[PDB]
Amino acid sequence: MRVRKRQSRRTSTKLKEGIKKKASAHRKKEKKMAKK
Amino acid sequence: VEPVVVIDGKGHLVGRLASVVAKQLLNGQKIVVVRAEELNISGEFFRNKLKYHDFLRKATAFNKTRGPFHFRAPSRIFYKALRGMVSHKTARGKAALERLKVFEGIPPPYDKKKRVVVPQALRVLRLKPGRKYTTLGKLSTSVGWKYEDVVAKLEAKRKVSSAEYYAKKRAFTKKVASANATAAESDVAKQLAALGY
């Protein structure tokens, strides 16, 4: 068959570093939500 | 140790096979894999086929006569597995590859010549019993290669001639092994024993 497009496993540097910022954002939320 | 080194790429593992051939070269050792078709990979057929197929889907969009040349022949199919395993764009690479030689089946003067194996890339040893592997002969055929049959045919006949040769061999061996046994316990002999030989 016509073999469809494969997703990449190369994580671009913008993605990888943006992943770190989103992670640390989830921390700051979790520390605040722990107090209530 | 030898000038040349003929590998019997049967029941091997492309990867571990290539990687043990690759470096072997770069170190200036001449090598000639044979019986490539009979080579092996790892994983339920379909699996690989599906794999390759996606590779067979990559072409220089605007001019596909320029992009990744997709080779079928089990050889080439295993030359690309060893190639991308050697800085093949430099000079020290080209010079390396140049002392490498892949053959699907066994032709002369390789036939009439000793042929080794690579334990560290032997499927029987490496793989765990009861775990689908994917011969190379199949994958190839079911993707373009069109000489599976011929070789097969030309391979069976290449064995026969081989068998007979042997037969003759086992005999002449026996004869020598029997004469020797009869040379035992003869001062000289006796002595050697004390010196292991």
Binding site: - | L192, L195, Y197
Partner: protein
């Protein structure tokens, strides 16, 4: 009209199976499987060979085709009793495998002059053997 199903015969790991240690402090000595611990580890002791009683991996060891009658959990003296009574040491020395090990050790500790004796003796043996052939 027989039901010939053959065979796939192995060396079973059992209590009283004599083994040969590949690597370690002992390395090349015989021991007997005293007790089986699990799939990977056994308990071994060869008192006459000199190896202390220890828990060892079956990766470290290789089974030899010889067996003897040993009761399970046997202490060193009991192992030495059945070891000597069955005479597994002489049955080991009788085998081709011990002869091959001793063969490599004999060739290792050879002097150059003794190696030159082997040179000369093989020349003489070659002569008589080549005369023994080209006859039949």
């Amino acid at each position: 009209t027989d039901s010939i199903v053959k065979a796939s015969n192995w060396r079973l790991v059992e209590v009283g199976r004599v083994v040969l240690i590949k690597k370690g402090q002992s390395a090349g000595k015989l021991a007997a499987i005293v007790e089986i611990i699990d799939q990977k580890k056994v308990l071994i002791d060869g008192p006459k060979a000199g190896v202390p009683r220890q828990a060892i991996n079956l990766g470290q060891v290789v089974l030899t085709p010889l067996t003897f009658a040993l009761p399970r959990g046997a202490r060193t003296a009991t192992v030495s009793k059945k070891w000597a009574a069955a005479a597994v040491c002489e049955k080991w020395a009788a085998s081709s495998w011990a002869k091959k090990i001793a063969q490599r050790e004999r060739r290792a500790a050879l002097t150059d002059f003794e190696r030159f004796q082997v040179m000369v003796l093989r020349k003489q043996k070659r002569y008589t053997v080549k005369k023994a052939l080209a006859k039949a």
